[PDB]
Design a protein around this ligand. Structure first.
Ligand SMILES: *Cc1cc2c(cc1C)nc1c(=O)[nH]c(=O)nc-1n2C[C@H](O)[C@H](O)[C@H](O)COP(=O)(O)OP(=O)(O)OC[C@H]1O[C@@H](n2cnc3c(N)ncnc32)[C@H](O)[C@@H]1O
Ligand code: HEM
Ligand SMILES: Oc1c(Cl)c(Cl)c(Cl)c(Cl)c1Cl
Ligand SMILES: O=C([O-])[C@H](O)C=C([O-])O
Ligand code: SF4
Ligand code: F3S
Ligand code: FES
Ligand code: NA
Lengths: 588, 105, 238, 122
C-alpha cells in the first residue's frame, strides 16, 4: 500500500435518492458507512424531479397495491420482473409514509392527507378507470425528497465524503469487489476506500445523448466502472424519452401537467392523443406518447418557431390559480427556457432523453448479478446497486411516471435492510493486493500522462451526435449498424485523448475527462444491445422488426463486457401474493 | 442575551425620540435666544429631569450600539476590550458631567 | 457579435495571489444564451477554468456567482442581462467565503450554520398518526416560500453581518431553514429551538439590510423569515 | 492559506443596503457629537459670560458647518431608525419593494430636516 486506505463496512458511491436512503438505513443497522458523492449531496439529479412519487396510498380515492402492480407490469411491456414489482408496489405505502414522518413537505388534501395526482399509466381495477396515485409536493417533489433525506442523514451523523470522485472498482484475486479508488476533487488526493460492501448508486446517463433532461453530471459513471470490472449490464437499449421536454432546451416539464388536465395539440389544434390512445389519451404509457408526438412531427403536423419542431402542450385552461398552486415549478421553467407564460400560451415540447431503464442487474436485496459460463446467475461478492444505476428490473422496457422515486426509496431501503445477511451470506473476502489497487488507477494514470493526444471536447460531441441520430425514439437496422461502427472509431480516438489541465487543486477538467470514459462505455453497451434485440418492445422501436416477439424476446438482454457480446436472462414471472399477470397485447 | 439588547435599544430609542421632539419643540418656537430665556428653560424641573433621563437613555442605547459595531470590525480581544473600556467610561462621564452641569442651574 | 469577459482566477500551486483575466467569446448574434453556456464554452478554449454546475436549470444551486457585482446563478442569468456596450462582463466568486480555486468557494461555514439550527423534523412521538401526519392545507401553506431554498449561498454571501461573523451569525439561508422548522406543524420542538436562538448573534445580527432578498434566485425572502423568528423570540423571552 | 473575495468595490449594493450602512455611520458620529454637544451646553450655562462665549463660537462659519452635519447625522439616525422600528412592529412590510420605497422616503424626510437644520444654524 502506497496509498491511504479508508476502511468501512459499506461504501455508498452516490448521494442522491437511492444512495442517501441506503446510507441512512445501513447506518441505523449498526454498520459503518461512507457516503461518497462527486457533488454536494443535495445537487444530485434527484433534486430536479418534479411530478412526484407513485404509490398506492389510496388518499385521493380508494386504491390497491395490486392495481399499481398491474399498471407497472403492463407499462413495462412484460419484461419487468414481476416478483420485484410485487415487492415494490406492496412495500411502497409504508416506505413512503416513512418519508412523510421524516418531514418531507408533501402537498395536502382538505382533510390533511398527502395529495395525490393522476399521472401516466394509472388505472383502477386492473386496466379500468383512470386513477390518481402520484403523491407530490407541488411540482418540486424531487427537491423535497432529496433535501429531506439529506437532513435525515445530517441528523443521523452519517459520514459523507462530499466532492470525491469514484474512479474504479477494486477486485481481489478472487474476483470479489472489495471497495474502490476515489479522487478527492478539492485536494487531488487519491485514496482506496475499503469495504465489505460497495453499493453503486450513481444514477443515470442521459448525457450520452445530444439533448437530455438529465443534469450535466449524469455520465453513467456506474455503468463504466461496472463494465471495466467485468460486470455485465442489462436491458441497456431501453432508454425512456420523456414525451414533454422543452423544445430546443431539453429542460423537462412535468408529466404532472397532463395529470392535472393538460393535453397535447398538433399544428392543426387536434388533441391527437385521443387518436393514438383512445382510453388513456394524454396519460398513456410514456414510450407511446413519445412516439405519437414524433409521428405527428414526422408527417408535417408538427409546429414550428424559434424552438424547432415541437408539439403544443396546453395548460392555460386550468386557470392561473391552479397552475401557480399545483405546478409553479414549470411556470418558471417554461418562462425561463421557452419565453412562454403557460398561463396564457401553450408550452413547446418534444420527447427528450430522460431515464435509463438499463443498468447493473440486481436481486431485491441490492446484490449485483453476473452469469457464469453455463448462463446461470451468480452474485458478485461485495457489489451492490440501487436506484437508476440498477436494473432490478422493476421498469422493464418502459418506466411509469413516479415509479423511479418509489424505486430509489424502496430498494435503497431494502439494500440496507438486508446488508447484514448479504455480507454473512457471501463470507469474508480476501484482501486486495497492492497491484489490485494499482489496477484501478490505470484509467486515471493514462489521462495524467497524455499531453498531446486528441481533444476530448470533439470526441464527446461526436459521441452524443451519434447516439442522437441512431439510437433515438425510432431505430432502423442500418443506422444502428453504422452508429455502432462510428462508435468503435470514436472509442479508439478516446484511448488517446488528452488531459489539457494538469493541476491538482479542484481540477474539474480531469473529472470531466474521467467522466467521458463512462459516457463511452455506456453509449457503446447501449448500441451493441439495441442492435441485438431484433423486435420492438416498450421504448425500443425498430422499423425492421415492428412486432413484439414474445416467443424469442420475452427476456432481458445482457451485455457481457469481457467478450463484448450479448446474451439473455429470464424475466421473472412468479409473484408470491397473487398469480402472475400473463403477457397480452399492450395498448392504451 | 440578545432579546434583552433588542428590547433595551428600542426602548431607549422611544425615550430619546420624545426628548428630541421636546428639545426641537423649544428651539423651533423661542425666537430671541437671550441668555435669560435659555437659562430659564434649563432651570425648569421638567427640563432637568427629561435631560438626565435622556442621558441615561444614551448610556444604554449607545453602549449596546457601539458594542455591535466593535464586535463586527475589531477582532483582537485585547484591542477590543480596551476600546470598550474607553467607550463606556466616556458614556458614564457623559451622564455624570450632565449631572454636574444641570444640577448647578 | 463578440463578448468580453473578466474572470477571477486563482490556483494555489501557480498563483501568488488571485487575478482578473480577460476572455473573449464569439456569440451567435441572433440567439441569446445563459452565462453558464458561455462558461462551458470558455472552458473548451481554456480547459483550466474551474467552476461548479450540474442541473443547468436553476434548481440544484451549484453555480452561484458574483456577476457584474451582484450574486445569482449562471445557468439562469441570460447574457443579455449582463451585457452592456463597452464594458466587460465581470465574473467573481461569491463574496466572503474562502476561494478554493478560480470560481469555486469553500461552502464549509455555510453548511455549518445550516446544521447549527438543527434542520430536521423533531417530533416527540406522542399521539402518533394512524398513517401520515395530518396537516391541513392551511398549515401546509406556512411552509411555502421556505422549503424551496436550494442552499445556493447567494443570500448569505451577500450579507455583511455574515461576512463579519460567519460562524456566530446564522445568516439568511440558515435562519430561513430554522423558520421552516419553527412553523412546521409536525415539529413539536418549537420552544427548545427558540431557546437556542436567544443569544446576541444567531438571529439578532441582522439589521434588515435586505441584500438577502434581492439576490435569491428562488425569489424567497429571508428578511421576512428572520422577522417572524424575532417575534417568536420576543413572544417567548420578553 | 486561501484568498477570499471581499473587495467591497467590486460589489453592487441596493438602496436598502446603503440605507443602513449610513444608519451605522450616523450612529457612531452621533456618539462623538454628544460629548461635543455637552461640552458646548456646559459652557453656555456656567455664567452670563460663558453664554456669550458660546454664541460667539456658534458664530464661526466653520462651527456652523460642523453643527449642521452633527444635526444632519442625528436627523438621519432618527428617521432611518424609526423606519427600522416600524418594520420591527409590523407597520412596514419586509418585502424588497417596501424596503426600497421606505428607504427613499427616509432620505427625503432627512433632506427636509437637514435644511430646517441649516436654517436653525444660519
Ligand atoms: C432528470 C429527471 C428525472 C426525474 C424527474 C425530473 C428530472 C428532470 N422527475 C421524476 C419524478 O417526478 N418522479 C420519478 O419517479 N422520477 C423522476 N425522475 C427520474 C428520477 O429523478 C431519477 O430516476 C432518480 O432521481 C435517480 O436517483 P438516483 O439516486 O438513482 O441518482 P441521482 O439522484 O442522480 O444520484 C447520483 C449520485 O451519484 C453520485 N455519483 C455519480 N457518479 C459518481 C462518481 N463517479 N463518483 C462518486 N459519486 C458519483 C452523484 O454525486 C450523485 O450524488
Ligand atoms: C442620541 C444618541 C444616539 C446614539 C449615540 C445612537 C447610536 C446608535 C448606535 C451606535 C447604533 C448601532 C449601529 C449599528 O448597529 O449599525 C444604533 C442603532 C439604532 N439606533 Fe440609535 N443612537 C442615538 C439615538 C437614537 C434615537 C433617538 C433613535 C430613535 C429612532 C435611535 C434609533 C436606533 C435604532 C432603532 C437602532 C437599531 C439598530 C439595530 O440594533 O438593529 N437612536 N444607534
Ligand atoms: O459592515 C457593513 C458593511 Cl461592509 C456594509 Cl456594506 C453594510 Cl451595507 C453594512 Cl449595514 C455593514 Cl454593518
Ligand atoms: O414528469 C415528471 O415529473 C417526471 O418525469 C416523473 C418521472 O417519473 O420521471
Ligand atoms: S434562500 Fe435563496 S439565495 Fe438563500 S440559499 Fe436559498 S435559494 Fe439561495
Ligand atoms: S442581507 Fe443580511 S442583515 Fe439581514 S435582512 Fe439580510 S440577512
Ligand atoms: S447549475 Fe443547477 S443551479 Fe445553476
Ligand atoms: Na435502471
Amino acid at each position: 500500500m502506497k496509498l491511504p486506505v479508508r476502511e468501512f463496512d459499506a461504501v455508498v458511491i452516490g448521494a442522491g435518492g437511492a444512495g442517501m436512503r441506503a446510507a441512512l438505513q445501513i447506518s441505523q443497522s449498526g454498520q459503518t458507512c461512507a457516503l461518497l458523492s462527486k457533488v454536494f449531496p443535495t445537487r444530485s439529479h434527484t433534486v430536479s424531479a418534479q411530478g412526484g412519487i407513485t404509490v398506492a396510498l389510496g388518499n385521493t380515492h380508494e386504491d390497491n397495491w395490486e392495481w399499481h402492480m398491474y399498471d407497472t407490469v403492463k407499462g413495462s411491456d412484460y419484461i419487468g420482473d414481476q416478483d420485484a414489482i410485487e415487492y415494490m408496489c406492496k412495500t411502497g405505502p409504508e416506505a413512503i409514509l416513512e418519508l412523510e414522518h421524516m418531514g418531507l413537505p408533501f402537498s395536502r388534501l382538505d382533510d390533511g392527507r398527502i395529495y395525490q395526482r393522476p399521472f401516466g399509466g394509472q388505472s383502477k381495477n386492473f386496466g379500468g378507470e383512470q386513477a390518481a396515485r402520484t403523491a407530490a409536493a407541488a411540482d418540486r417533489t424531487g427537491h423535497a425528497l432529496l433535501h429531506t433525506l439529506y437532513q435525515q442523514n445530517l441528523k443521523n451523523h452519517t459520514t459523507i465524503f462530499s466532492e470525491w470522485y469514484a474512479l474504479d472498482l477494486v477486485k481481489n484475486q478472487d474476483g470479489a469487489v472489495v471497495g474502490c479508488t476515489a479522487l478527492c476533487i478539492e485536494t487531488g488526493e487519491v485514496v482506496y476506500f475499503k469495504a465489505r460492501a460497495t453499493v453503486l448508486a450513481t444514477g443515470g446517463a442521459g448525457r450520452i445523448y445530444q439533448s437530455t433532461t438529465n443534469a450535466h453530471i449524469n455520465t453513467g459513471d456506474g455503468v463504466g466502472m461496472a463494465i471495466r470490472a467485468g460486470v455485465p449490464v442489462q436491458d441497456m437499449e431501453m432508454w425512456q424519452f420523456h414525451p414533454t421536454g422543452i423544445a430546443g432546451a431539453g429542460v423537462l416539464v412535468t408529466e404532472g401537467c397532463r395529470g392535472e388536465g393538460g393535453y397535447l395539440l398538433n399544428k392543426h389544434g387536434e388533441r391527437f392523443m385521443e387518436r393514438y390512445a383512445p382510453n388513456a389519451k394524454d396519460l398513456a404509457g410514456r414510450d407511446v406518447v413519445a412516439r405519437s408526438i414524433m409521428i405527428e412531427i414526422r408527417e408535417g403536423r408538427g409546429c414550428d418557431g424559434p424552438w424547432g419542431p415541437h408539439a403544443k402542450l396546453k395548460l392555460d385552461h386550468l386557470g392561473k390559480e391552479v397552475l401557480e398552486s399545483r405546478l409553479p415549478g414549470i411556470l418558471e421553467l417554461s418562462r425561463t427556457f421557452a419565453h412562454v407564460d403557460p398561463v396564457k400560451e401553450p408550452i413547446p415540447v418534444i420527447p427528450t432523453c430522460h431515464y435509463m431503464m438499463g443498468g447493473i442487474p440486481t436481486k431485491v436485496t441490492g446484490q449485483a448479478l453476473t452469469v457464469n459460463e453455463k448462463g446461470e446467475d451468480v452474485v458478485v461478492p461485495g457489489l451492490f446497486a440501487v436506484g437508476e444505476i440498477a436494473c432490478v428490473s422493476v421498469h422493464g422496457a418502459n418506466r411509469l411516471g413516479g415509479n423511479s422515486l418509489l424505486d430509489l426509496v424502496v430498494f435503497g431501503r431494502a439494500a440496507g435492510l438486508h446488508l447484514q445477511e448479504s455480507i454473512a451470506e457471501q463470507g469474508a473476502l480476501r484482501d486486495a493486493s497492492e497491484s489490485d489497487v494499482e489496477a484501478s488507477l490505470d484509467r486515471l494514470n493514462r489521462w495524467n500522462n497524455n499531453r498531446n493526444g486528441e481533444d476530448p471536447v470533439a470526441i464527446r460531441k461526436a459521441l452524443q451526435e451519434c447516439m442522437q441520430h441512431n439510437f433515438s425514439v425510432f431505430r432502423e437496422g442500418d443506422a444502428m449498424a453504422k452508429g455502432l461502427e462510428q462508435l468503435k472509431v470514436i472509442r479508439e480516438r478516446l484511448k488517446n485523448a488528452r488531459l489539457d489541465d494538469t493541476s491538482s487543486e479542484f481540477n474539474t477538467q480531469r473529472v470531466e475527462c474521467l467522466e467521458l470514459d463512462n459516457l463511452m462505455e455506456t453509449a457503446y453497451a447501449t448500441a451493441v444491445s439495441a442492435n441485438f434485440r431484433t423486435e420492438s418492445r416498450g421504448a425500443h422501436s425498430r422499423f425492421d422488426f415492428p412486432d413484439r416477439d414474445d416467443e424469442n424476446w420475452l427476456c432481458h438482454s445482457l451485455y457481457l463486457p469481457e467478450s463484448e457480446s450479448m446474451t439473455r436472462r429470464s424475466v421473472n414471472m412468479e409473484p408470491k401474493l397473487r398469480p402472475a399477470f400473463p403477457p397480452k397485447i399492450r395498448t392504451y | 442575551n440578545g432579546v434583552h439588547d433588542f428590547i433595551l435599544v428600542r426602548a431607549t430609542a422611544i425615550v430619546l425620540t420624545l426628548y428630541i421632539i421636546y428639545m426641537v419643540g423649544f428651539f423651533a418656537t423661542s425666537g430671541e435666544l437671550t441668555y435669560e430665556v435659555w437659562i430659564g428653560f434649563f432651570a425648569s424641573a421638567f427640563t432637568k429631569v427629561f435631560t438626565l433621563l435622556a442621558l441615561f437613555s444614551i448610556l444604554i442605547h449607545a453602549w449596546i450600539g457601539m458594542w455591535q459595531v466593535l464586535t463586527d470590525y475589531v477582532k483582537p480581544l485585547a484591542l477590543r476590550l480596551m476600546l470598550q473600556l474607553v467607550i463606556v467610561v466616556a458614556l458614564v462621564v457623559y451622564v455624570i458631567y450632565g449631572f454636574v452641569v444641570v444640577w448647578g442651574v | 457579435m463578440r463578448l468580453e469577459f473578466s474572470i477571477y482566477r486563482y490556483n494555489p500551486d501557480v498563483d501568488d495571489a488571485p487575478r482578473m483575466q480577460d476572455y473573449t467569446l464569439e456569440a451567435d448574434e441572433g440567439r441569446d444564451m445563459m452565462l453558464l453556456d458561455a462558461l462551458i464554452q470558455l472552458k473548451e478554449k481554456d480547459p483550466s477554468l474551474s467552476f461548479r454546475r450540474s442541473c443547468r436549470e436553476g434548481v440544484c444551486g451549484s453555480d452561484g456567482l458574483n456577476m457584474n457585482g451582484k450574486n445569482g446563478l449562471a445557468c439562469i442569468t441570460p447574457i443579455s442581462a449582463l451585457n452592456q456596450p463597452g464594458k466587460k462582463i465581470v465574473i467573481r466568486p461569491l463574496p466572503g467565503l474562502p476561494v478554493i480555486r478560480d470560481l469555486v468557494v469553500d461552502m464549509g461555514q455555510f453548511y455549518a450554520q445550516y446544521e447549527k439550527i438543527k434542520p430536521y423534523l423533531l417530533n416527540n412521538g406522542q399521539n402518533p398518526p394512524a398513517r401520515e401526519h395530518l396537516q391541513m392545507p392551511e398549515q401546509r401553506e406556512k411552509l411555502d416560500g421556505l422549503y424551496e431554498c436550494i442552499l445556493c449561498a447567494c443570500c448569505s454571501t451577500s450579507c455583511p453581518s455574515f461576512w463579519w461573523n460567519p460562524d456566530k451569525f446564522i445568516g439568511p439561508a440558515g435562519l430561513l431553514a430554522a423558520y421552516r422548522f419553527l412553523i412546521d406543524s409536525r415539529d413539536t420542538e418549537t420552544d427548545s429551538r427558540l431557546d437556542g436562538l436567544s443569544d446576541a448573534f444567531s438571529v439578532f445580527r441582522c439589521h434588515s439590510i435586505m441584500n438577502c432578498v434581492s439576490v435569491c434566485p428562488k425569489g424567497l425572502n429571508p428578511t421576512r423569515a428572520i422577522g417572524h423568528i424575532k417575534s417568536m423570540l420576543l413572544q417567548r423571552n420578553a | 492559506q486561501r484568498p477570499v473575495n471581499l473587495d467591497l468595490q467590486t460589489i453592487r449594493f441596493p438602496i436598502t443596503a446603503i440605507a443602513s450602512i449610513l444608519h451605522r455611520v450616523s450612529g457612531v458620529i452621533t456618539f462623538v457629537a454628544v460629548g461635543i454637544l455637552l461640552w458646548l451646553l456646559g459652557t453656555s450655562l456656567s455664567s452670563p459670560e460663558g453664554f456669550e462665549q458660546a454664541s460667539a463660537i456658534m458664530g464661526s462659519f466653520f462651527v456652523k458647518f460642523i453643527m449642521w452635519g452633527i444635526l444632519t447625522a442625528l436627523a438621519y439616525h432618527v428617521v432611518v431608525g424609526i423606519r427600522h422600528m416600524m418594520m420591527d412592529f409590523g407597520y412596514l412590510e419586509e418585502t424588497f419593494e417596501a424596503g426600497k420605497r421606505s428607504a427613499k422616503i427616509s432620505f427625503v424626510i432627512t433632506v427636509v430636516l437637514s435644511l430646517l437644520a441649516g436654517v436653525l444654524v444660519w
